[PDB]
Every structure is written in structure tokens, then in C-alpha cells.
Amino acid sequence: SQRTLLLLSQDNAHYERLLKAAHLPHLRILRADNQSDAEKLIGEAHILMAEPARAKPLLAKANKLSWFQSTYAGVDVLLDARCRRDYQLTNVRGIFGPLMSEYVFGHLLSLMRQLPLYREQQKQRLWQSHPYQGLKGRTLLILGTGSIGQHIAHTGKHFGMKVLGVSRSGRERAGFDQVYQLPALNKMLAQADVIVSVLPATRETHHLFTASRFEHCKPGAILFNVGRGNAINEGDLLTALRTGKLGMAVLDVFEQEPLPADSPLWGQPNLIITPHNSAYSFPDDVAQIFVRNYIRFIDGQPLDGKIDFD
């Protein structure tokens, strides 16, 4: 049917429904729900929509492939020097702001209002209130000023927080009271009640939250990492949490995922772990990205979310 799209996603059923509703002419839509079925089909696909980990073992067979739309923001497994680069790769961007605000502030208010304590008191039929504080006037520091950083910024300002951003990059962006740059980090950390790391993994962001020097910043601070495991040296985050250098940590991402059942991280009382699910790629929004990119693609125009292999 002119070009062929292959769907290789855990959300295939949803994608197939959505894409069949979109009525795209001259496009045959094929689906493979396991790797075995995909083996037979991938050589026929001009377009692929898939999770990177599912496509990766099939990619050497993808000899008609022109454009691969990843359903995930993260595509690092496809930058492997062993993998082909003779196609256009796009990822998913710009749709995770609200979901990240929900995750960050759900976890933050859970902590601030001590919900788990109240749940445990309820199990023992104990009526007892404890002190807490509001968010009014507290300082939110966000590392990363893109659409994700900005949305979390507007939410903090909504909750009456001061909002400082870190970037260089540099630019003042919407939702931030002030935006500073890496040199100002320690000065900014010192006044941070809540810290949200949403950084791309650069050599300069490798182990930002370094062993100790850095962790020397505030008894009751809550640190979120929702960017990449790389921002944090885990061994030294641990000691920070064990010795009152940091109040709490909420981590959605890790140096190794799934986090090995071995990890000392699991057991640390003031560490909260989520299985890399702070902001899911919802098919309704990803399909919209796909169809807009499809229109550009068949016209020969530049794709959005395009990944530079170099």
C-alpha cells in the first residue's frame, strides 16, 4: 500500500486503532506484538514506530527503513556505534510538562503532609496530628529549563513557591523568577527547599550531584531526579541521606534499570523509588506527534524531534 509502517510497541493495539482512525492514504499499517513476528516484517517497513529497546535487535534487518518514530523520549540505546544510522530517528518531546508537575508535586505534597505516616497510623487506629508546613514561600530549584522545567515552574509559582532555574543555556524562561547557570549552582542549592533535576546527560552533567562537595547543601531539602540516572553518583547520594546532608530523595531514574533487586537504594528509609514512570508516553499524544511528522515526512520537510546521530 505504497509505504509500510510497522508498529512495534507495547501499545500497538492503541496505536493501530488511532492510526486507522487518522486515515493516512498510501500507508499500509502492519503490527508485530512480539520479536518473532517482527523478524518477518521489519525488512518491509519504510516507517517504524516502536520503543527503542524493541527495535534495536531488529534494526540490522530494517533495510527499507527511512524514518523511525520512537515512542520514548530516551533513545540512547540507538546511538550505539554498532547500530546503523542510515535513517531519520525522531523521539517524543514537549508532551511531558503536566505529567511531570503531577509526579513532582504529588510526591512533594506526599512528603510535606506526611501521608505515609497517616496511612500507618490508620492501620493502628491511632488519631494523632503532627506538625507540618505549607509550600508558601519555599524555594523550588529546577535544573533544566525546557518545557518540562517550565511546567514544574508554573506549578511551583501556583503553590506560592519561589522558583529558580539553572541552565546555561542562560535565558530567562516563563515560570522562573530567575534563571542562573551552572557556576551559580552551589549558591542556588544553599537556598533550595526542593530540588528538581531534569538534566540531559552531558559530560558536564555527569555526576553533578557529586559524592559530597555538592551534597553539602541543606538538612531538609528534597531532591528529585527525573532526568537520567547519570546526574547522581548513587554511592554518595546514599551517604548524604544517611548522615543528614539531604532530607529526602525521590528518584524515577537510575544508573542501572531496572534497578537491580541488589541495590542498597531500595532499603534507604528517606529514599523513594519509582520505576521510571514519572511521565508515560500516552498513545493519544504520541500518535498526534507521529501524524504531524508523517505529513512533513511525505512532503520531504524537516521532522520535529529529530535526533542528530553526531
Q: Which of 93, 206, 257, 292 is catalytic?
A: 257
Is the distance from CB of 140 to CB of 161 less than 8 angstroms? yes
Method: X-ray
d(CA 74, CA 1): 31
Point out the catalytic residue in the list 3, 46, 151, 276: 276
Q: What is the 3-state secondary structure (H, E, C) of the chain?
A: CCEEEEEECCCHHHHHHHHHHCCCCCEEEEECCCHHHHHHHHHHCCEEEECHHHHHHHHHHCCCCCEEEECCCCCHHHCCCCCCCCCEEECCCCCCHHHHHHHHHHHHHHHHCCHHHHHHHHHCCCCCCCCCCCCCCCEEEEECCCHHHHHHHHHHHHCCCEEEEECCCCCCCCCCCEEECHHHHHHHHHCCCEEEECCCCCCCCCCCECCCCCCCCCCCCEEEECCCHHHECHHHHHHHHHCCCCCEEEECCCCCCCCCCCCCCCCCCCEEECCCCCCCCCHHHHHHHHHHHHHHHHCCCCCCCECCCC
C-alpha 19/C-alpha 9 separation (Å) is 13
Closest CA to 107 of 219, 191, 215, 226: 226
Which one is catalytic: 51, 151, 228, 234?
Answer: 228
Please, are residues 73 and 93 in contact by the beta-carbon 8 Å criterion? yes
Query: Domains in the chain, start-ordered, CATH in brackets?
Result: 1-96+282-310 (3.40.50.720), 97-281 (3.40.50.720)
Beta carbons of 139 and 221 less than 8 angstroms apart: no
- 47 and 4 Cβ atoms separated by less than 8 Å: yes
**Residue 257 a catalytic site member:** yes
Residue 180's region, left for phi above 0, alpha for psi from -120 to 50, else beta, is: beta
Active site annotation includes 207: no
Q: Which residue has the cell 548524604?
A: 240
Kindly list the distances between the CA atom of residue 136 and the CA atoms of 4, 36, 149, 289, in Å, as whole numbers in the listed order. Answer: 54, 55, 19, 37
CA nearest to 197, candidates 142, 270, 279, 274: 142
Q: Which of 211, 168, 159, 160 is nearest to 188 (CA)?
A: 168
Tell me, yes or no, if 228 is annotated catalytic.
yes
Compute the CA torsion angle 82, 282, 146, 161 (nearest 10 deg): -140
117 burial type by CB count under 10 A (0-12 exposed, 13-18 middle, 19+ buried): exposed
Question: Residue 22: what residue type?
Answer: A
Distance of CA 44 to the CA centre of its chain: 32
